[PDB]
């Protein structure tokens, strides 16, 4: 019997079942003996007993490994490096930039008068002026900034704060003349105005051009996991109580629908958008704010037929609005709408690129249209003439990674933050000119604890089960031998058109260095890496393609002697938890360790909790007889293998006790079912629970994850 056992007991309800309609079988009665664990922690002693017993059990196993502390100290020392964003020009004639001196809980906002920016981000420190220090907001540094928008006048700054990481927030307002001071004690937000906008679940704030107020989306007053219902658009006037905010839109008929508004840069036109699922399709309306008082008494005109396409404002020129849209263009395009001829529809300005996903369109230096394409699992910046749509060439085409682009239509320059698996963040300045532009290196992030020249990222292609060519990035020390001995950390997502882009994580390079490991990112189907068709081949009845791509990546690494067959660790979060639990179910013999973060695992019950019903466009509708059949085949909660052909890998599940985005019940129920199916291991299945994440929490979680992988795969730390 394994010395760490036995598992904490978990009450079973042997009578708890639901009957689902099935095209193949007529109906299927599914038993759920852990259905009680769907009741929130707050509302159930049973759920409390489970969380507390499972938490202590995991904490005992993890803290017994001395490498847990070794990892925490290694991570803490190495993470103590200065981090910053690109400069962002604002309407108060300051550049704003995020800064962390190394080990602060949260990023701080700094600023510098435009023209004095050559004095910031030096050996001496951030320079400029401290504007907003989120660390002041709470005692533990758990209250995070969820977003901010400066008023067009530059006198006001609207910002979102989530208390206790809870994914509910309040919106606050402060004067740009009221920066945080370094002398302020923690626990309070001094210098803010009385404005308090409660009951907000996502930050979307749009100021009017008069800087008198802003549109926002909120919910009825409410830790719980019931469906997110009755999203409403409100307009808040600066200085008033929230009780005075004017209702702009509700749709009582469709409580699951999410709604918001965006204004054109000029502030003249308002775009209403509703979504009814996670798909890139909207119900869309346009109002002319010059013709309307703000409220439910506004003259909405239809932009296009509902549920065919998504529309995002990218600019305006009087009555003409620039849209980034997927209308009959799944990889997105740029089209113009004339609000003066709404029946004439959209005119194409930039045609769909059939081999490249259009991620953003923005206007710079008056009439330069800057397009960011995703092609070959990395960003490309294309410059177009705004008037004709004519190509003016590429910039930064030598850099393969991702870009954050900063700059407005009225600015002749941009700041571009470049990053990859190996580049932690270089800020370039690009200055547009009469014929050609000028590129300069502004500032680079430097990591004192690590020699980036020791590492490489390989670009390879491998065939999946069905012969589809899949691209994979492989990060490793240059001096690791491909002799089939190296451990692997293999990370995937596969869904919702979300690309796994080259992304800097110091933690992952330290895993590669300390364990002589490879870090593998297969660009599996479900993402946008090769365009929207890459998502379509990895969703609904084709979700199995995602798991097969990931499995085939592992087999390819073993076959080509990158990795020992006995040291594969896999990792995945949210939708990525469908990936890790399905792959663990379908090929347990491939994997030695499985890390699941905030996992979606019950593919039948997901629609019943918070935002889950929106994911029916991705996974299918489990209450639909045809969809039920293909979902039930892989639903990881329902497909745990019998012991015997199966040695189950060691498995660590991360979750909070309350989480709005993925209800922790997915992890609660799956951990119980795994422990019950495999009561004697031999490899432990553990739930690591936390009762805008802080640096401290991220490192303590990373130290559990890495020390658990080390223990489970028999790795020695080679410091």
């Amino acid at each position: 019997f394994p010395g760490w056992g036995p598992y904490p007991p978990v009450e079973r309800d042997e009578t708890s079942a639901i009957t689902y309609s099935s095209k193949l079988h007529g109906s299927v009665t599914v038993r759920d003996p852990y259905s009680q664990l769907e009741v929130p922690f707050e509302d159930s002693e049973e759920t409390k007993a489970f969380v507390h017993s499972q938490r202590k059990f995991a904490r005992t196993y993890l803290d017994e490994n001395p490498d847990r502390e070794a990892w925490l100290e290694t991570l803490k020392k190495s993470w103590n490096y200065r981090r910053f964003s690109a400069l962002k020009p604002e309407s108060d004639g300051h550049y704003y930039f995020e800064y962390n001196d190394g080990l602060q809980s949260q990023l701080s906002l700094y600023r510098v008068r435009m023209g004095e920016e050559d004095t910031v981000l030096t050996e001496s420190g951030p320079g400029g002026e401290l504007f907003f220090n989120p660390n002041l907001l709470s005692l533990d540094g758990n209250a995070a900034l969820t977003g901010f928008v400066m008023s067009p006048c530059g006198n006001y700054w609207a910002y979102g704060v989530s208390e206790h990481g809870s994914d509910w927030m309040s919106i606050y307002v402060r004067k740009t003349s009221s920066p945080h001071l370094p002398s302020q004690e923690r626990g309070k937000d001094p210098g803010r105005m009385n404005d308090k906008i409660r009951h907000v679940r996502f930050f979307i704030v749009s100021w009017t051009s008069d800087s008198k107020g802003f549109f926002y989306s909120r919910y009825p007053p409410e830790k719980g996991n019931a469906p997110a219902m009755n999203c409403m658009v409100y307009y808040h006037r600066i200085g008033e109580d929230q009780e005075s905010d004017v209702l702009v839109h509700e749709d009582p008929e469709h409580p699951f629908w999410i709604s918001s508004v965006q204004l054109t840069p000029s502030g003249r036109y308002i775009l209403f958008a509703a979504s009814r699922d996670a798909s890139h399709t909207q119900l869309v309306k346009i109002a002319d704010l010059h013709e309307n008082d703000i409220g439910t008494n506004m003259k909405w005109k239809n932009l296009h037929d509902p549920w065919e396409a998504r529309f995002t404002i990218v600019g305006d020129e009087g009555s003409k609005i620039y849209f980034m849209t997927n209308l009959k263009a799944k990889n997105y395009k740029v089209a113009t709408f004339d609000a003066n001829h709404p029946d004439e529809g959209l005119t194409t300005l930039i045609a769909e690129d059939p081999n490249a996903f259009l991620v953003s369109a923005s206007i710079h230096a008056q009439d330069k249209l800057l397009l960011v394409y995703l092609r070959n699992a990395s960003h490309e910046i294309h410059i177009r003439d705004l008037t004709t749509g004519k190509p003016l060439g590429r910039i930064f085409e030598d850099l393969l990674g991702q870009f954050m682009v900063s700059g407005r239509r009225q600015d002749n320059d941009i700041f571009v933050l470049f990053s990859s698996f190996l580049s932690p963040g270089t800020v370039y300045r690009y200055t547009f000119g009469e014929e050609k532009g000028y590129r300069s290196l502004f500032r680079a992030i430097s990591i004192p604890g690590l020699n980036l020249d020791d590492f490489m990222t390989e670009s390879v292609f491998y065939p999946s089960k069905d012969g589809t060519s899949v691209h994979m990035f492989i990060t490793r020390p240059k001096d690791v031998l491909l002799d089939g001995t190296s451990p692997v950390l293999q990370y995937g997502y596969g869904g919702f058109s979300l690309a796994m882009l080259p992304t800097f994580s110091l933690s992952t390079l330290l895993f590669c260095k300390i364990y002589r490991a490879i870090y593998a990112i297969p660009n599996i189907r479900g993402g946008s890496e090769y365009g929207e068709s890459w998502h379509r081949e990895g969703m609904l009845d084709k979700k199995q393609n995602v798991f097969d791509d990931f499995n085939a990546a592992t087999e390819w690494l073993i076959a080509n002697k990158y990795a020992s067959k006995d040291r594969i660790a896999i990792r995945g979060g949210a939708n990525g938890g469908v990936l890790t639990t399905a792959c663990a179910n379908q090929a347990p013999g491939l994997y030695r360790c499985v890390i699941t973060i905030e996992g979606i695992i019950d593919m039948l019950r997901f629609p019943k909790f918070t935002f889950g019903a929106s994911w029916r466009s991705e996974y299918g509708d489990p209450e639909d007889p045809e969809d039920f059949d293909f979902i039930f085949k892989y639903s990881p909660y329902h497909n745990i293998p019998p012991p015997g052909d199966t040695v189950m890998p060691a498995m660590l599940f991360f979750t909070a006790a309350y989480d709005d985005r993925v209800s922790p019940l997915h992890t609660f129920k799956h951990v119980a079912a795994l422990q019950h199916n495999f009561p004697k291991g031999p490899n432990p299945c553990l739930m690591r629970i936390d009762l805008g994440k802080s640096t401290q929490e991220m490192l303590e979680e990373t130290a559990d994850e890495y020390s658990f992988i080390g223990k489970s795969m028999g790795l020695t730390m080679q410091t």
Binding site: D277, Q282, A574, I597, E598, I600, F611, W615
Partner: peptide
């Protein structure tokens, strides 16, 4: 656009 589980 939507509320998606990521990370």
């Amino acid at each position: 656009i939507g509320v998606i589980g990521s990370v």
